[PDB]
Amino acid sequence: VEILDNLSNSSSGLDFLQWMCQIYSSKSRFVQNINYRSIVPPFQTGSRTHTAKFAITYLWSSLINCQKSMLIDKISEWVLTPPFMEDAEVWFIYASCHLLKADTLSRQFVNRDIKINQVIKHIHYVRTFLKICLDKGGFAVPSRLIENQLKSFESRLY
Amino acid sequence: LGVGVQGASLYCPQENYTTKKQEKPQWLRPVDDTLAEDALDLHIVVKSLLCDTDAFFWDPTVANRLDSQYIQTASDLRNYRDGTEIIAYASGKTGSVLNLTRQNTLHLNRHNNVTSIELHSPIKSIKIPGASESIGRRSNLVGIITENSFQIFRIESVHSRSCDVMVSSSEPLYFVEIDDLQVVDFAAIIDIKGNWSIGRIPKNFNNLIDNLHGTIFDPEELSSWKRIEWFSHFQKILVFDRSKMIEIDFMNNWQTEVVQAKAWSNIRDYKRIDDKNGILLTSREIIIVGASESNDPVRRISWKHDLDPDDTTLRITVQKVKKPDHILLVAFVYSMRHKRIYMHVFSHRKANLFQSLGCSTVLEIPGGTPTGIETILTLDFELVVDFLVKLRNSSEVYYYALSNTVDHPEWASLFNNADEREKESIGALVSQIKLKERERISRVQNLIEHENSHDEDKYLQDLGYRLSIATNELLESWQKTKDESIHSKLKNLLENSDSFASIPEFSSLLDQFFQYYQDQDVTFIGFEKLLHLFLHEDVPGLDIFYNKLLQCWVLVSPQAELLTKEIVKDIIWSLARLEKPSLFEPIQNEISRSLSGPYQDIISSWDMDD
DNA sequence: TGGAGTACAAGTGTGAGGAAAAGTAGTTGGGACGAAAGCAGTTGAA
């Protein structure tokens, strides 16, 4: 919080969470037998079947940071690369990155054969990443309320 | 309904940028993080009194010694009256004597009469259950927990013409099984060390356990801290140790383990918030505001905050703040080892939209550590909030309000003898110095009477003459004794260095005495490169060394001068080590010791390498 | 106007504690370019 809420010559905290998720990337299994001294899982380590909290804070705070910069392609290219096949929160973020492109591009700037179908691609990415998010374990989304927003992107498109 | 949940758990932790967004594209801060947004919130104490009256471990079974909440008695039902505020605290010798209204700040009332009901057992917990708003009324009965029995008090028709609360009591049930019970709550429903039972309260004080009971007994939890609370009016109970929370509904036979807190944390405290949905839990390492669920009233594990302090003795108290748009839940954790509070601000809206704002900390009184802290309900953006503390190792209770906008008797019990014949016999010495000082303020005053006289120029010509030949007497022994092969005093003359009346002259005179010894067996240590150790700055001189103390001791002394003169006249004679020989004398004592040690300590003794 | 009991301190042996950076204790990661022809002695059964 100190780098982001300093704002003077700041890295805004996002290059430091990038530092955390580079050198503490460890897909190793949690051996669950040794007594643990000076480490604890739920806030500072990142084993297999547990995404690290600095990893998902790097995903939330770079989606929100990219929204406020209006580069979403570059986060959507990164989230593509790690298919965390053990959790639903990364897939909700990956579904929500495409919802933001499907939100931004659904203004149409007229009152176009390529402007149409690209939004349909992002709408179909949301409906298929939210489905695989909901098939996983516990991450309860307002899955009705998001469908009201995807249809609203298409009614503006028609 | 925000999005980032586990279902099982739900986090808004310590400044780690909470884990949700709806992406509400509504141009109205298009995000609904659990983190909220506002300005700051600084808190300011309003310190005021309300009332009054081996060590490497601490007892978990002792809980509190007081209570403070609005009570509505039996005669207020039929009549118009609604709600009277009381405070009942232990007193006495071993904590055994349990004993009101609000003008603008809560103060003890006019007739201010302690209703000292008497017991024969140590008080170890004093608490009400609280009230309900579904019942519409307030409870007028309170239960306390002691070592020897369990007691119930019943408050009947609090009086207004005399400010006197007559109290009634139930039968104090002693122990059939010899096991010290821990916690009461009602919403004799009690928790013994390892098992619980439901107790029945009667209507007739003019003269127990029901046929259903349960146990949570763990062979590998070691502590003696348990806790019980009724949950969400279903006659579900919640039972605690330091390792798990068990949910038990005695309506059916239905027992579920919900929290299992063995691995990295422990359950520390559990306050049931007057909100019949939301209830706040203090674990070690996290603060949990786990509410109730509308589908099944089991546990809505809500937005919890990762608290930082690690400790073994943390409590919590919570106060609701009811605004018309939303409900706040400020949570105050406090420890028995140090003097601090730690707070966090929660908010709640209609759609179970629990949020979080930030944290702050303030301090307490320096004498003791807090042991019981309770918020006054206050009958129910500039947040105001008020409460009472109680500190351990002091029997005083003070009252505090928070708005948005060191003496120890052990040093006293080391002096002050009761020996009246030895009183002035000690006290003569403080009157003995009444004589000895006034001579010294007057004799150097006779030197104040003279100012750079030739009669005292003679007196200092006589000074160095018995410093020259005395040196010439103290030199001529060391040359003949020089072959010792195995410094001095400069207080040999006891005739002078008492009545010399110039600092810049004697500084020059010793420099006049320094220049005289060009010969061997005599060196010195210079004062001006060393006199700075008292002022802790660059002091290159002896004459400006007085000039620092000259401006320094002006106010705090009668006439302020010759006392300041005499100490400067003392320190150069206090470092009276000016009797070093030449360089030859320690160098020839270097070479003698390495010869005496073996050839193994030759290579061990080498200074000046790199 | 000597003795009987007795707490305050000067003074003397027993082991028990304290710490660190070296090494070693169990899991998991990881190491190993070929589907050619007429023909002949033996050899099929007639």
Swiss-Prot record, chain A:
Keywords: Nucleus, Transcription, Transcription regulation. Its main location: nucleus. GO terms for molecular function: RNA polymerase I core promoter sequence-specific DNA binding; RNA polymerase I general transcription initiation factor activity; TBP-class protein binding. It is found in: Nucleus, Nucleolus. Transmembrane segments: none annotated. It comes from the Eukaryota. One of its GO terms (biological process) is nucleolar large rRNA transcription by RNA polymerase I. One of its GO terms (cellular component) is nucleus. Present with 476 molecules/cell in log phase SD medium. Acts as a component of the core factor (CF) complex which is essential for the initiation of rDNA transcription by RNA polymerase I. After binding of UAF (upstream activation factor) to an upstream element of the promoter, CF is recruited in a SPT15/TBP-dependent manner to form a preinitiation complex. Component of the core factor (CF) complex, which consists of RRN6, RRN7 and RRN11. The CF heterotrimer may further dimerize to form a hexamer. RRN11 interacts with RRN6, RRN7 and SPT15. This is RNA polymerase I-specific transcription initiation factor RRN11. It comes from Saccharomyces cerevisiae (strain ATCC 204508 / S288c).
UniProtKB/Swiss-Prot annotation, chain B:
Pfam families: Rrn6_beta-prop, Rrn6_HB, Rrn6_K-rich. Keywords: Cytoplasm, Nucleus, Transcription, Transcription regulation. InterPro entries: RNA_pol_I-sp_TIF_RRN6-like, Rrn6, RRN6_beta-prop, RRN6_HB, Rrn6_K-rich. It is found in: Cytoplasm; Nucleus, Nucleolus. Transmembrane segments: none annotated. GO terms for cellular component: cytoplasm; nucleus; RNA polymerase I core factor complex. Present with 237 molecules/cell in log phase SD medium. PANTHER family: RNA POLYMERASE I-SPECIFIC TRANSCRIPTION INITIATION FACTOR RRN6. Component of the core factor (CF) complex, which consists of RRN6, RRN7 and RRN11. The CF heterotrimer may further dimerize to form a hexamer. RRN6 interacts with RRN7, RRN11 and RRN9. Acts as a component of the core factor (CF) complex which is essential for the initiation of rDNA transcription by RNA polymerase I. After binding of UAF (upstream activation factor) to an upstream element of the promoter, CF is recruited in a SPT15/TBP-dependent manner to form a preinitiation complex. This is RNA polymerase I-specific transcription initiation factor RRN6.
